[PDB]
Amino acid sequence: PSVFLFPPKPKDTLMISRTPEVTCVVVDVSHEDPEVKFNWYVDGVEVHNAKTKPREEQYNSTYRVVSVLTVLHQDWLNGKEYKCKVSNKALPAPIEKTISKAKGQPREPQVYTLPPSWDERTKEEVSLTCLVKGFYPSDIAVEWESNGQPENNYKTTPPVLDSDGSFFLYSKLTVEASRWWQGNVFSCSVMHEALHNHYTQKSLSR
Amino acid sequence: PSVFLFPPKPKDTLMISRTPEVTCVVVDVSHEDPEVKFNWYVDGVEVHNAKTKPREEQYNSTYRVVSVLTVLHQDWLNGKEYKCKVSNKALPAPIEKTISKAKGQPREPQVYTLPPSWDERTKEEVSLTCLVKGFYPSDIAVEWESNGQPENNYKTTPPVLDSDGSFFLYSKLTVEASRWWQGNVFSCSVMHEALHNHYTQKSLSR
Amino acid sequence: PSVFLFPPKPKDTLMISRTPEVTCVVVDVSHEDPEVKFNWYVDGVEVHNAKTKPREEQYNSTYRVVSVLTVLHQDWLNGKEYKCKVSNKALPAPIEKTISKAKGQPREPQVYTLPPSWDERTKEEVSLTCLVKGFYPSDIAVEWESNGQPENNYKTTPPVLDSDGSFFLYSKLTVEASRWWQGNVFSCSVMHEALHNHYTQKSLSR
Amino acid sequence: PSVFLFPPKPKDTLMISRTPEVTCVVVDVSHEDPEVKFNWYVDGVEVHNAKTKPREEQYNSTYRVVSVLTVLHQDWLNGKEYKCKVSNKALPAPIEKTISKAKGQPREPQVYTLPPSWDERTKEEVSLTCLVKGFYPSDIAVEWESNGQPENNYKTTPPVLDSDGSFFLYSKLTVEASRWWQGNVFSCSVMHEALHNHYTQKSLSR
């Protein structure tokens, strides 16, 4: 068997509106001895405010085990680790996986609202570009809203490493040219750590 | 024992200068029985001399072997299937994995160049962007060039799926401000199968 | 009988998607001897399958027989030699005919896009010109496009030798004056061996 | 034996200082019986102004015999029909071949002088351009000249048929930078039958 530790979503670790959780999925567990045992060493503390073993739903008849641990918004922000010790009889050795926030000095994302191209102006759909560059923790979230209500038809690229060791990404919004030309306002919503109150909003129109 | 088949590089399939290769990577293998055997089948017929064997090792204790098959540009860009038959002792049955081009409508790439943002002015280095959307087959190559010779400070995004069933990506060239202001012209060179001539270029200046 | 060896077309050698083929035309054969054997030698090695030989007749009361040998992109660009051997009536000695890519240090073409004249302003149509000069391999493919779509009424002069041992050609695009005066952007797509990525382009507007 | 009739050269059809000439080349005359009887007739009237040159031996043990007929500048350009009746002892009945001037409504060239392009200013040597378009008879003659005296280093493209069924060609003069920036006059001298006085001149300066 093998184990993979997955981190929490980047939005819930900046927002007190939701719960941040780290999930430890054990896979290729034969039915021989399920005996899945999760010993969560937060920092150096072995006791676990652990959560259910749901086992989710069957793909090749499940055999897949998950435990989730509610983490603290502050603990992940303060760069401390979370182990996951999977002990099984079919394992000669236990599998210990450690996850921690990107251990560097956080940098602020520089948001830039790039407007449509001259080439695109003669089209029924025009594409609005937000560029988010310069953030060291690749843990970010980009959303698009206009006049205060959310929008759809947008797609954000994964963060990509740059030359300075930082990260950047582009978020593109597809709107009809009816709204852009009539002068509606569109807003790029970026949520990172280094931003003041984990939120910045740059607005775009013409 | 687990195997992986990788298509040729996009530039290599769209360019007369290079030799495109499908790559069959068997990972983990064993330490006890490192001998692998590669059998390459194109469209049902076995290709022998067409493949070479890179001899390799690794640092997860276990080794990594890899075999590469030179295809003809026109065979890959047609509906041809390439099968890899990996036999090792550690496997009961040979593992056969087949790969071929993305069957479907070739859809033409639209190259949009967006100029530097107002905020990046009065800064040391500026960033120039290249939005490429609408291409389907997802095997695309994009580089930058100014005054004939190429440029190095570019990173292009992983092709991200759109609602249309299309694809898009972005490209970021970071140039010294003074070269941008001195009027030098930068160009975005994209290669794809759906393009007439398999090549297009958009320009960025002022 | 007479024999003639014809080389690949220039666009076919610089674009993968096309089959470049050398053509061996024997004209003025006789009714007494209507069966002509063509034996193709490439770099000495005889290739028989790569032949395809149809048949037909001309108004001369003579016959014309043709044999095509599909060449590889990599060979012609790397100066390999192609031979076709034509033995019909008498003449045991079939051919002296052998073709190759010209031998010379390749030279990069120089594209200059020159705008319509002052006199052409005041006319229903305008003519846009593309000076391509300085190339030593002579094999070049030049076309006009706009809006990423190929154009139609353009005509290009054959390559003509310049004083420098280089070649130069000119390409005229004929487009409606409404189109030029409304601000479209027209471009010159030139493919040649010496160019970086075998493709360059310059554009014109206003 | 095979008969060929070659028309007069374009420059001397327009200029009175030269003598235009129709030439009648008979080839594949054999050693056995040379003795070729050239009998010319213009329109319908046989003329005895023709001069049969001596017989000339080739490497193929064939004789080539030629006769030249001096024509009238008007009569050629008036579309008159010139026939050559060659009679040998070998052939059964004499061979005849006819040439006339290109029979279509003559069309006047339109000459535009195009200056050099922006990219070309930085170069030690700069190229001036002459576009001659819209002319029907493919027989034209182009020259370059600055400050009266004729000029060197000018190369003309072959005539090129266009879509409208007329012809066009380019002429490039290569001059050093100093000549162009100093404001010197440059002139493109174009001689075509539809031009009044068969000569025009267009000019190009800074």
Side-chain angles (χ1 to χ4, degrees):
Chain A
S2 301
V3 79
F4 316 100
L5 197 37
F6 300 114
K9 308 184 300 291
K11 190 163 162 58
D12 57 48
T13 316
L14 304 172
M15 202 176 53
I16 324 168
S17 311
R18 29 178 89 177
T19 48
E21 41 183 352
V22 289
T23 179
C24 203
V25 180
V26 187
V27 298
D28 302 350
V29 191
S30 183
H31 218 166
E32 45 67 17
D33 291 323
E35 203 247 346
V36 283
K37 197 173 188 175
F38 296 94
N39 303 335
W40 287 81
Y41 295 36
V42 179
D43 313 352
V45 186
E46 317 159 351
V47 75
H48 35 79
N49 192 20
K51 289 163 99 290
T52 177
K53 171 184 61 183
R55 289 176 159 268
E56 184 185 75
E57 303 180 11
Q58 59 164 1
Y59 250 87
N60 290 11
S61 299
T62 326
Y63 288 166
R64 175 180 178 265
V65 183
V66 191
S67 71
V68 278
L69 202 173
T70 321
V71 315
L72 279 173
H73 311 80
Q74 325 92 31
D75 289 19
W76 192 265
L77 269 41
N78 291 345
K80 57 193 55 174
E81 67 175 1
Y82 290 73
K83 304 183 186 170
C84 178
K85 288 192 178 179
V86 183
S87 303
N88 197 5
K89 309 189 180 184
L91 277 172
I95 322 282
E96 158 197 326
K97 270 201 162 181
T98 62
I99 54 170
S100 166
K101 195 186 58 63
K103 288 150 290 296
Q105 276 300 322
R107 293 172 179 95
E108 186 194 10
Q110 301 289 337
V111 183
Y112 301 108
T113 47
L114 312 162
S117 188
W118 302 109
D119 297 31
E120 222 168 1
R121 314 294 186 81
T122 58
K123 296 192 172 59
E124 42 185 4
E125 279 185 341
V126 80
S127 147
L128 277 67
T129 305
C130 188
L131 164 55
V132 202
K133 53 182 291 295
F135 52 98
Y136 174 74
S138 66
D139 308 304
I140 198 185
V142 189
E143 294 179 340
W144 283 85
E145 308 164 9
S146 164
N147 282 345
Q149 287 223 11
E151 213 77 359
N152 42 23
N153 262 286
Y154 72 89
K155 217 79 56 185
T156 298
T157 72
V160 50
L161 190 75
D162 203 4
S163 313
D164 57 352
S166 84
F167 284 87
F168 79 95
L169 66 78
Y170 283 85
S171 186
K172 154 183 159 305
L173 180 70
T174 313
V175 283
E176 59 166 344
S178 316
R179 290 198 293 263
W180 172 250
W181 290 124
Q182 282 170 355
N184 296 49
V185 185
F186 294 87
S187 302
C188 187
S189 308
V190 170
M191 314 183 55
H192 184 257
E193 327 176 357
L195 300 169
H196 199 262
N197 292 15
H198 304 158
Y199 188 87
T200 197
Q201 200 182 15
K202 305 280 183 161
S203 307
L204 186 64
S205 71
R206 206 36 53 92
Chain B
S2 47
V3 310
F4 290 113
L5 261 63
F6 297 107
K9 314 168 203 50
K11 182 171 178 63
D12 302 34
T13 52
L14 286 306
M15 195 172 168
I16 55 172
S17 311
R18 301 201 175 186
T19 56
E21 50 192 9
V22 284
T23 314
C24 192
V25 179
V26 56
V27 280
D28 259 351
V29 291
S30 298
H31 221 278
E32 312 163 352
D33 48 85
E35 193 207 344
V36 199
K37 187 171 54 185
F38 287 86
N39 293 330
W40 280 89
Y41 296 90
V42 52
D43 265 2
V45 297
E46 190 161 356
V47 281
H48 289 94
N49 201 93
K51 85 205 169 193
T52 324
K53 219 83 48 192
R55 323 281 160 84
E56 280 295 323
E57 286 205 4
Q58 258 277 345
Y59 266 12
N60 198 3
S61 309
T62 54
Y63 303 147
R64 171 195 182 185
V65 202
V66 53
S67 180
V68 283
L69 195 89
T70 304
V71 305
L72 297 184
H73 302 73
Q74 210 162 9
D75 286 3
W76 175 260
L77 294 172
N78 279 352
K80 280 205 179 48
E81 214 173 11
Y82 297 87
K83 176 164 63 173
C84 186
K85 192 173 305 188
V86 172
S87 305
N88 186 3
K89 182 164 65 63
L91 57 75
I95 317 183
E96 316 182 15
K97 269 202 56 178
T98 68
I99 57 169
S100 45
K101 205 179 61 73
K103 322 288 184 181
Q105 181 170 331
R107 274 220 276 169
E108 210 194 6
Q110 321 166 12
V111 179
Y112 297 100
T113 37
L114 297 89
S117 191
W118 286 61
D119 307 354
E120 281 217 90
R121 306 190 214 278
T122 77
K123 277 265 184 299
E124 291 201 349
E125 275 191 340
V126 290
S127 306
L128 292 72
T129 83
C130 207
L131 163 57
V132 183
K133 36 176 302 186
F135 64 101
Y136 163 74
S138 177
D139 264 21
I140 199 181
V142 52
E143 40 184 16
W144 287 83
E145 73 160 26
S146 180
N147 292 356
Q149 58 165 341
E151 287 258 350
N152 281 9
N153 210 339
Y154 71 95
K155 304 292 182 305
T156 84
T157 69
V160 52
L161 189 71
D162 226 340
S163 314
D164 314 328
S166 48
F167 276 87
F168 79 92
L169 63 71
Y170 275 93
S171 188
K172 189 171 63 58
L173 183 67
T174 305
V175 81
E176 188 190 358
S178 73
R179 195 139 70 257
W180 176 243
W181 300 125
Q182 280 183 2
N184 281 35
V185 55
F186 302 96
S187 299
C188 195
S189 304
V190 155
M191 327 172 61
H192 192 74
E193 42 184 290
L195 282 163
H196 164 74
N197 291 353
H198 300 332
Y199 215 116
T200 199
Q201 271 199 12
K202 208 57 206 177
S203 55
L204 206 42
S205 57
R206 187 208 168 274
Chain C
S2 68
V3 295
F4 294 116
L5 245 190
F6 292 109
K9 308 93 192 169
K11 192 164 169 65
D12 298 12
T13 69
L14 298 156
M15 193 181 182
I16 51 171
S17 80
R18 301 193 173 186
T19 53
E21 60 183 20
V22 294
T23 317
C24 207
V25 180
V26 56
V27 202
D28 284 3
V29 306
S30 314
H31 287 87
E32 178 178 343
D33 50 277
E35 211 54 49
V36 192
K37 39 142 290 188
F38 309 87
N39 286 350
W40 295 82
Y41 295 80
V42 46
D43 71 271
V45 181
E46 206 170 358
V47 279
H48 315 89
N49 201 25
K51 173 212 303 285
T52 303
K53 196 267 303 178
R55 260 277 304 273
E56 47 173 318
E57 172 171 349
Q58 214 85 3
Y59 300 98
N60 262 19
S61 89
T62 65
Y63 272 54
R64 165 192 163 106
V65 197
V66 282
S67 171
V68 280
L69 187 98
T70 312
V71 305
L72 204 175
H73 295 84
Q74 204 160 358
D75 294 356
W76 182 263
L77 293 185
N78 280 334
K80 294 308 297 165
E81 318 220 10
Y82 294 96
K83 174 179 299 184
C84 157
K85 148 185 299 181
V86 194
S87 174
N88 196 2
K89 185 196 58 178
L91 271 163
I95 53 78
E96 185 207 20
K97 307 310 194 81
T98 297
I99 42 188
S100 57
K101 195 184 64 62
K103 301 300 174 60
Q105 299 168 356
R107 273 212 239 179
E108 196 181 4
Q110 309 161 22
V111 176
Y112 307 110
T113 42
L114 299 111
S117 192
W118 284 86
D119 310 336
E120 287 226 42
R121 308 173 196 183
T122 68
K123 289 182 56 189
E124 306 258 30
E125 312 289 309
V126 288
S127 303
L128 287 72
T129 81
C130 196
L131 165 60
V132 201
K133 59 170 296 189
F135 54 98
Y136 215 109
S138 180
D139 296 321
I140 194 186
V142 55
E143 320 165 9
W144 279 85
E145 69 170 5
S146 174
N147 292 356
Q149 290 205 4
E151 291 282 319
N152 42 36
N153 192 359
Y154 68 99
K155 284 294 175 183
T156 83
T157 70
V160 53
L161 185 80
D162 207 5
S163 320
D164 312 342
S166 59
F167 288 80
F168 87 89
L169 71 78
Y170 273 97
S171 179
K172 191 179 53 61
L173 177 61
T174 312
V175 75
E176 186 175 334
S178 61
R179 303 184 55 180
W180 172 257
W181 290 118
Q182 280 167 348
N184 281 6
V185 48
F186 300 100
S187 310
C188 197
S189 41
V190 159
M191 320 170 53
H192 183 84
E193 335 174 354
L195 290 164
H196 193 245
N197 293 351
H198 314 289
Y199 181 96
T200 205
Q201 189 187 255
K202 199 67 216 75
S203 57
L204 192 57
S205 72
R206 284 159 290 83
Chain D
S2 190
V3 51
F4 291 108
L5 203 48
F6 297 94
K9 78 191 170 189
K11 186 175 176 58
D12 73 6
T13 53
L14 312 162
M15 267 174 52
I16 46 174
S17 173
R18 316 175 78 93
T19 50
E21 274 184 352
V22 280
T23 57
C24 196
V25 177
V26 180
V27 187
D28 292 359
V29 194
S30 62
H31 285 191
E32 291 90 55
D33 40 18
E35 296 299 320
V36 195
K37 312 148 197 176
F38 300 93
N39 202 355
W40 290 82
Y41 52 101
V42 182
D43 270 10
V45 189
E46 296 191 359
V47 278
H48 314 93
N49 327 128
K51 292 174 183 55
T52 301
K53 302 207 301 186
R55 321 169 313 184
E56 48 194 352
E57 164 77 304
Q58 284 281 349
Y59 322 93
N60 300 47
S61 77
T62 44
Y63 267 20
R64 175 177 57 166
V65 195
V66 187
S67 64
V68 294
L69 180 84
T70 317
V71 310
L72 277 191
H73 305 80
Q74 305 93 355
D75 284 1
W76 178 251
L77 301 169
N78 284 357
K80 270 197 175 55
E81 294 259 341
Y82 292 82
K83 311 205 205 306
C84 188
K85 179 174 303 194
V86 304
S87 189
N88 192 6
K89 312 145 62 179
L91 56 83
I95 321 166
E96 308 177 15
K97 260 195 180 176
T98 180
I99 52 174
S100 62
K101 184 57 185 194
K103 302 196 308 176
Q105 290 248 27
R107 280 163 176 93
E108 204 187 13
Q110 303 173 5
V111 188
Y112 306 103
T113 43
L114 281 295
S117 201
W118 304 80
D119 311 348
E120 216 177 5
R121 320 283 181 80
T122 67
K123 305 298 177 64
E124 32 181 359
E125 289 198 355
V126 191
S127 64
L128 270 67
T129 307
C130 199
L131 164 60
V132 200
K133 57 186 303 299
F135 57 92
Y136 175 76
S138 321
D139 289 33
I140 197 178
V142 186
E143 291 176 346
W144 275 86
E145 52 193 55
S146 166
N147 265 357
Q149 261 59 47
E151 223 154 357
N152 43 26
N153 238 0
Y154 86 86
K155 226 78 58 181
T156 308
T157 72
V160 187
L161 177 64
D162 210 356
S163 308
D164 68 343
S166 85
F167 289 87
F168 80 89
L169 64 76
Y170 283 91
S171 189
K172 178 176 63 63
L173 178 77
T174 51
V175 285
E176 77 154 341
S178 324
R179 300 270 301 276
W180 179 242
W181 307 121
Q182 284 172 354
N184 202 6
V185 61
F186 295 99
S187 293
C188 184
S189 307
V190 167
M191 325 182 55
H192 189 253
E193 74 167 75
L195 285 163
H196 178 254
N197 281 1
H198 302 326
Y199 182 84
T200 199
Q201 185 171 329
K202 300 296 192 313
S203 301
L204 198 55
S205 50
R206 250 214 68 178

